[PDB]
Amino acid sequence: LWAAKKYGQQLRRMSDEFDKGQ
Amino acid sequence: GPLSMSCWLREQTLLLAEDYISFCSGIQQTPPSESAEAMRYLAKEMEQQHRTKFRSLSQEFLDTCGADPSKCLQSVMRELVGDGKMNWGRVVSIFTFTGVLASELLSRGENSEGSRRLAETIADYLGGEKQDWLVENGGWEGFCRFFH
């Protein structure tokens, strides 16, 4: 696991939560 | 044509990114467009919901990236959507993250030139690399209506 993938996955999870509330 | 549409989408996105970044840089001005008003609200909502994590990520990012934050941001955006899927929520997170990044660079004594480069990176990526998805979803006017 390298930095860019770490940060991308973190942002992905927060985006998914944002969709759950929208 | 595809080139004409991409150029237009890139400019529309640049204006939007520049406005949000300025909004995050202490400047107070009325939103220039309905889409800007929407992005200001939504991207700050996402920040408020994850403020500590965004702050920590921005500082890690800038401390591991080095010379070219724009290049590093392209790699993050690529990995964010690395599962082939694209949606407006992921777009919002790109704006939220870049807004925090821009604010951190200003806190560290950098000039507004770095802010502009990040805005252009967002514009090139969404308006160029993701032009087909943007178009099929109605562009930034579709973004506005999707979030009512």
Author numbering:
A (entry chain B): 3 to 24
B (entry chain A): 1 to 148
Q: How does the study describe this entry?
A:
NRZ is a 19 kDa protein expressed in the epiboly of the extra-maternal yolk syncytial layer (YSL) of zebrafish eggs. In vivo, NRZ has been shown to be a potent inhibitor of apoptosis after serum withdrawal, and controls development during somatogenesis and gastrulation. Similar to other pro-survival Bcl-2 proteins, NRZ adopts a conserved Bcl-2-like fold consisting of eight α-helices that form a globular helical bundle. Our findings suggest that NRZ is a unique pro-survival Bcl-2 protein with an unusual pro-apoptotic Bcl-2 binding profile unlike its counterparts in mammalian systems.
NRZ utilizes the canonical hydrophobic binding groove that is also found in other pro-survival Bcl-2 proteins to accommodate the zBad BH3-motif using a combination of hydrophobic and ionic interactions as well as hydrogen bonds. To accommodate the zBad BH3-peptide NRZ undergoes localized conformational changes. Upon binding of the BH3-motif, the C-terminal end of α4-helix moves by 3.0 Å relative to apo-NRZ, thus enlarging the binding groove to accommodate the Bad BH3 motif. Detailed inspection of the NRZ: zBad BH3 complex interface reveals five salt bridges between Lys93Bad and Glu75NRZ, Lys94Bad and Glu56NRZ, Glu105Bad and His46NRZ, Arg100Bad with Asp79NRZ and Asp104Bad with Arg86NRZ. In addition to ionic interactions, the NRZ: zBad interface also features three hydrogen bonds between Arg100Bad–Leu76NRZ, Arg100Bad–Glu75NRZ, Gln98Bad–Lys49NRZ. Finally, the four highly conserved hydrophobic residues Y95, 99L, M102 and F106 from the zBad BH3 motif protrude into the ligand binding groove of NRZ and are accommodated in four hydrophobic pockets at the floor of the binding groove. To validate the structure of NRZ: Bad BH3 we mutated two key NRZ residues involved in ionic interactions, Asp79 and Arg86 to Ala, and examined the ability of these mutants to bind BH3-motif peptides. Both mutants showed substantially reduced binding to Bad, with D79A displaying a tenfold reduction in Bad binding, whereas NRZ R86A displayed a 14-fold reduction in affinity. The binding of zBad to NRZ buries a total of 2366 Å2 solvent accessible surface and solvation energy of isolated structure −10.1 kcal/mol and ΔG of interface formation and dissociation of −3.9 kcal/mol.
